[PDB]
């Protein structure tokens, strides 16, 4: 998975988390962790809930 679209707003609460708003498109860097994916938005890196995005493919 390379790209995914946010289904809900996600608020980053820890240093390693990537916040986003619903409808934003995240570059997916890791999708092997089933709970938390690693990605990029606004050139910023962080982890976010896999269940908060829908892969685009």
């Amino acid at each position: 998975v390379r790209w995914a679209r946010a289904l809900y707003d996600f608020e980053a609460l820890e240093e390693d988390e990537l916040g986003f708003r619903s409808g934003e498109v995240v570059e997916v860097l890791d999708s092997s962790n089933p709970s938390w994916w690693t990605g990029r938005l606004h050139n910023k890196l962080g982890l976010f809930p896999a269940n908060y995005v829908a892969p685009m493919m």
Binding site: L13, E14, N51
Partner: peptide, 16 residues
Amino acid sequence: GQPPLVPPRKEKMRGK
């Protein structure tokens, strides 16, 4: 209406 839960933060580490 309400968004789903965020998974436990401990699962950010490897092995979920």
